[PDB]
Design a protein around this nucleic acid. Structure first.
Lengths: 233, 121, 52, 246, 67
RNA sequence: GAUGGGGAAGCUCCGUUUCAAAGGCCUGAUUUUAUGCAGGCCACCAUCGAAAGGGAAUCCGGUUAAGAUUCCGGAACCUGG
RNA sequence: UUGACAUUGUGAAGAGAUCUUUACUUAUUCAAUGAAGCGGAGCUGGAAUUCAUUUUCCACGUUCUAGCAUUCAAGGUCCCAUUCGGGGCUGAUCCGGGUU
């Protein structure tokens, strides 16, 4: 207390070598980082046509959680289950003379983007989820147009990873239900009614809009102070 | 949620584990036997009048030693073959393309005594 | 110099084997009388607050 | 024909600069926070002679802001500086000889040297000895500044462009007759291989456009079009007038 | 199948959507090296009718030649 | 003069720290065992290029048909451990 | 050295029955640095002169001197289980991560 002294260090330029601060904003990133950050900035600055930007309207977290808990019931067989039931029918079918229909009718989510697209065309899809993902965007951009054309409900949900876990893949890019059990028959239509509203019923009016055109916020702040302070002196 | 704190603007490779080799097969499968050994280091003595005049005087053995041998391998294979102890080794490459060695045994020995033990004197 | 005792390479002042002892005499004068007048400057910045 | 002597300087073999004794590239300090929001003080350690140049250099030693050390830089020394001088650098610095300020910070009629074309090029204009630019006016909106280049041209630059106050040392240099071919030999050994110059008149039709003939004479006009092409250009190039002034 | 739709979309290269993608992509590549590794085809059905399969040992590279 | 990159049908050219995720240290943390995990660091970032430039340290006497500041005898010195 | 087409997107003014200005930024181009202090809002005074109350910009730790400035920072405060010391907040305003 008597012996301890109070230094204070004076950062007033001109003196006191600066302290260590957080430079996280200023660092020079790798050139792969800096590409994928400006590949986002450049899709925001440009004017994105109406058939893009119909993505980025995506099912919000509430109906999202409600949506998967329906599909989560219907997940396809795993490898082991298939491995397991390939023993049963072997022992079941050959012995008891049965026709190898001995197993129940499976009800599972349909996946793959060549299969689902062919389901929609024969109108066998009761719902469809779509990932705002798929960097090769052209794969997925006509689906809202077929669904709305063929009178199939559809949705756009964030991520192909979550769409991938219920199919047991890494990534998926689509999902569908062509069949549903009577316990979930009523729980199905409560999702559709909320899903038809925000996607397939807004489809026509969304095709007017052009997204993007958002200025970065050092440009936005200089625009405003020119656009505001023109008027008010 | 929040981000890191970097006190310096430089981003360098994160140091990631390096993994030692675990070869499936081996390389040459037979380790090569000792290439330069006791007997291949010193092939012959040197019998010329000038050579033999040091042996019988200055207690110095004079050998024709292989080209690949250095003063460490020589001092070691004189001790091993001929049993002696060595003060000093001096070497020169003769201008026929071979190397001569002047090996000076310690005062505990007489090179003349060992010189005639292997059959030259 | 790697072979030599340290008394050959040094003198026993501060800044021994480096500055010429009249360059140490100054930078003591200059370190004392600059941070002397520098205290008188910081009271005037307390007075210039209350004086105005 | 042959390839002439001025076409032969481009490939730059024996024509490069003689760089050995040069103290370094004389520049101003990198433009940073401390200098554009305030000032930072160095002191000039020694003002010294640079080879190949006509003007002395000064070495001022700053203190690095973000790391403990000293950093010393090479300024072309303005006339009147002296070792032991404090040299202040930054927006809020003061108007005195040797202090480097932005040009917007100085009144019109101020004499500065080693001024920058664009902010942060570490100096361009008026670096030769005795030269200076004058600040003749400002343009506080869409910020510019009106300065008079040492030739007499009037250029308009940014107002964030720094420049150092005063005249560059080494004035009066060309007042002294050179007097002999030896002293011009010791001049260009430290610069480059330009010297001596054989008159293109005195060489053959291969060596030059002016060569040949049973008398020494050019034979066609010595003024050449700006739209001439490689190797045609020798003599007075694209001149608007010619001949002794009156 | 889904590849008869992608086929026709890439035959309209001045359509307002693809001339957006062409503009965002060409900026991507010009930052990358002149020859670099493509983790995945940009035209899955264009490569596929040329003999590409999706399996280990079919590799895609992206190459930029002066014009 | 490689590397990274950039041209070039190509042989190869540019450039030499350049639009680069370019590297291994000082020991504290261990007394299960040696080195995990630790804070801090330092950003100079190939190599080549001189028997006349820079540079760690050796002298006298004797000796051979022909070698010696090298061999002999004696008296020193430097460097790494 | 010029014109046209392509790179090449966003839209306003003014003349001519297409041109000249001029805006936007993200492409494209240039420049700097061991990609550190950008843009926006703030608090303190205060030039300011108040026609309701702030309308607005400037500010905002260093100038007799060839001294000195580095160890998560001393101080201040509070935690953890006191054990020697360690972890927080501030000292050093906050937000957007567009390196300028």
């Amino acid at each position: 207390n008597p012996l301890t002294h109070s230094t204070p260090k004076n950062f007033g330029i001109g003196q006191a070598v600066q302290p260590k601060r957080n430079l996280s904003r200023y660092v020079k990133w790798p050139e792969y980082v800096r590409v994928q950050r400006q590949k986002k900035i450049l899709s925001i600055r440009l004017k994105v046509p109406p058939t893009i930007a119909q993505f980025q309207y995506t099912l919000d977290r509430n109906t999202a959680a409600e949506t998967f808990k329906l599909f989560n019931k219907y997940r396809p067989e795993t490898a082991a289950e298939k491995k397991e039931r390939l023993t049963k029918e072997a022992a079941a079918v050959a012995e008891g003379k049965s026709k190898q229909d001995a197993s129940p009718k499976p009800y599972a989510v349909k996946y793959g983007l060549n299969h689902v697209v062919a389901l929609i065309e024969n109108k066998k899809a009761k719902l469809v989820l779509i990932a705002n993902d798929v960097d090769p965007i052209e794969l997925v951009v006509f689906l809202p147009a077929l669904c709305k054309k063929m009178g199939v409900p559809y949705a756009i949900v964030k991520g192909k990873a979550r769409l991938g876990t219920l199919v047991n893949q890494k990534t998926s890019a689509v999902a569908a239900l062509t069949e549903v059990r009577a316990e979930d028959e009523a729980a199905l239509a409560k999702l559709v009614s909320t899903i038809d509203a925000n996607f397939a019923d807004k489809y026509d009016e969304v095709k007017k809009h052009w997204g993007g055109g958002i200025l970065g916020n050092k440009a936005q702040a200089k625009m405003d102070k020119r656009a505001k302070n023109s008027d008010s002196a | 949620k929040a981000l890191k704190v970097r006190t310096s603007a430089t981003f360098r490779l994160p140091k990631t584990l390096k993994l030692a080799r675990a070869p499936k097969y081996a390389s040459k499968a037979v380790p090569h036997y000792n290439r330069l050994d006791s007997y291949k280091v010193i092939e012959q003595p040197i019998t010329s009048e000038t050579a033999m005049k040091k042996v019988e005087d200055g207690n110095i053995l004079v050998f024709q030693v292989s080209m690949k041998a250095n003063k460490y391998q020589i001092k070691k294979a004189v001790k091993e073959l001929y049993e002696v102890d060595v003060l000093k080794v001096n070497t020169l490459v003769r201008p026929n393309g071979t190397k001569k060695a002047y090996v000076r045994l310690t005062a505990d020995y007489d090179a003349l005594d060992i010189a005639n033990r292997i059959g030259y004197i | 110099y790697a072979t030599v005792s340290k008394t050959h390479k040094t003198v026993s002042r501060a800044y021994g084997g480096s500055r010429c002892a009249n360059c140490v005499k100054e930078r003591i004068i200059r370190a004392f009388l600059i941070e002397e007048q520098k205290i008188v400057k910081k009271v005037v910045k307390e007075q210039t607050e209350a004086a105005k | 024909g042959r390839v002439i002597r001025n076409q032969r300087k481009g490939a730059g073999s024996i024509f490069t600069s003689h760089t050995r004794l040069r103290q370094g590239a004389a520049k101003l300090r990198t433009l940073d926070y401390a200098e554009r929001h305030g000032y930072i003080r160095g002191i000039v350690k020694q003002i010294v002679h640079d080879s190949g140049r006509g003007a002395p250099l000064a070495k001022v030693v700053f203190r690095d802001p973000y790391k403990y050390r000293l950093r010393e830089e090479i300024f072309i020394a303005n006339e009147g500086v002296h070792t032991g001088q404090f040299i202040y650098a930054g927006k809020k610095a003061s108007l005195n000889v040797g202090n480097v300020l932005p040009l917007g910070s100085v009144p019109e009629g101020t004499i500065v040297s080693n001024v920058e074309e664009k902010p942060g090029d570490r100096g361009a204009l008026a670096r030769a000895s005795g030269n200076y630019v004058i600040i003749i006016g400002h343009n506080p909106d869409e910020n510019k500044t009106r300065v008079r280049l040492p030739s007499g041209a009037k250029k308009v630059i940014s107002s964030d462009a720094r420049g150092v106050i005063g005249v560059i040392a080494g004035g009066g240099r060309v007042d002294k007759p050179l007097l002999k071919a030896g002293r011009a030999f010791h001049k260009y050994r430290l610069k480059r291989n330009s010297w001596p110059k054989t008159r293109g008149v005195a060489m053959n039709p291969v060596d030059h456009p002016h060569g040949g003939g049973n008398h020494q004479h050019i034979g066609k006009a010595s003024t050449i079009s700006r739209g001439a092409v490689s190797g045609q250009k020798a003599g007075l190039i694209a001149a608007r007038r010619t001949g002794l002034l009156r | 199948g889904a590849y008869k739709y992608l086929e026709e979309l890439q035959r309209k290269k001045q359509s307002d959507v693809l001339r957006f993608l062409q503009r965002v992509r060409v900026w991507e590549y010009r930052q990358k090296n002149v020859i670099h590794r493509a983790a995945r085809p940009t035209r899955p059905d264009k490569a596929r009718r040329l003999g590409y399969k999706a399996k280990q040992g079919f590799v895609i590279y992206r190459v930029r030649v002066r014009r």
